[PDB]
Every structure is written in C-alpha cells, then in structure tokens.
Amino acid sequence: GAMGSMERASLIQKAKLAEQAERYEDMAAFMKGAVEKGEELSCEERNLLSVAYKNVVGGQRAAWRVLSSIEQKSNGPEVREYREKVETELQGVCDTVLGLLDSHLIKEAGDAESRVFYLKMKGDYYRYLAEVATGDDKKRIIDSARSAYQEAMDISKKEMPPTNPIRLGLALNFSVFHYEIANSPEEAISLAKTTFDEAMADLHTLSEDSYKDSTLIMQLLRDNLTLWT
C-alpha cells in the first residue's frame, strides 16, 4: 500500500496516463508502487520512473531556489520556516528514490544498461540532496554522489558505445556535479568536451533515429561548454 492492492500492469498503465495529464506526483506514486512489486523494470518502465521523479523534484528544487534567494536577501522566521518546509519535502522525495534504488533495484540489475541507469539516478538524487546540504554530512552526501556517478561511468565506458543516450546523460550530469557541487570546473569542462568529441566520432555508426537521440544530448553538452568557457 497504498499501491499494494493494484496490479503491476495497472500501475504502469496509470503512470502513462498521469504523464499525459501532467500529473507527475501521481505518476511517481504509481511507479513507486510498480517498483515495490519486486520485479525488475523494463527500459520503458525505467524511463517512466525517472521522468516522474525528475518532474516532482524539479518543481521542489525550483521552489527551493526561489525561497533561498529571498532568504539570502532578507539576511521574522517565516521565510526560513517555509524554505525549510520545501527543503524537507524535497529531501523526503530524494530519500524515497534512493530507497527504491537500494531496495532493491540496483542489486537486482544484472545488465550494464540497467545498472548504469540506476547508478546514474543514485548520483542524481544524492546531488539534489547536496544542493541543499549544509551540515556535518554534506561531504558524505557529495562523496556518495561522486561514487555512484563514478561506478556508472566505469561500467558505461566498458559496456556501452560513446553515443549511448544514457551514457551521454550520465556524463552531462556528472559534469554538472563537478562544476557546481564539487567546485571542480576544469574537471567539468574536460569531461563535457571528451564526452562530446568521442560521441561525435561514433555518430557514423548510427541509424537516423539513434543519430537524433545522440545529437540531442550532445547539444546539451555543447550548451554547457558554451556557458562555461
């Protein structure tokens, strides 16, 4: 519960309906329920999980940044209190996702494609925790993101072509981690550039449709390089 009484297939079907309705909180709850059925997730289902929580946490992060900026300018308790409220709700979502990955998506992922997908997610949600972290565990949170990203990179480099869209999105996000979380902008720039160039040199192997998928993400790498250099 609360999704324990619903069929796995019905949860997946309703997740897709929620996406069409832009009801991402519903989408996430349905996909949480599907994961908790205990069966491994398909590629399409992994994408549904990621899209749902991406959008939920995306709204929370955008709200947190608005409130944090207001709080910074103000420096009564109301601004801090409400920023804390949003922050706490954000941390709860990140904890929920990390709990699904740890129980038991990652350990049951016996393919490079699935394992890399989930380790990237683990790095992303530790990164979102790091964005709001300030206390005695910020360094441990940051290292947990780095570690997850690094293991994903190691596997993706061994087992995936340089144009694979999950490998490219992983590298994009690890590069942003370096730039704005780890205060390593040169690492961030180096990774974005090497990832872009190695994908460019592999495009000749791709179909027209794979070419579109890969160049879409390559453009995000180029956008960041243009912003950072």
Partner: peptide, 5 residues
C-alpha cells in the same frame, strides 16, 4: 542561461 541536465 541555466546549465542543463
């Protein structure tokens, strides 16, 4: 612009 992920 904001960096992209």
């Amino acid at each position: 612009r904001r960096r992209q992920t």
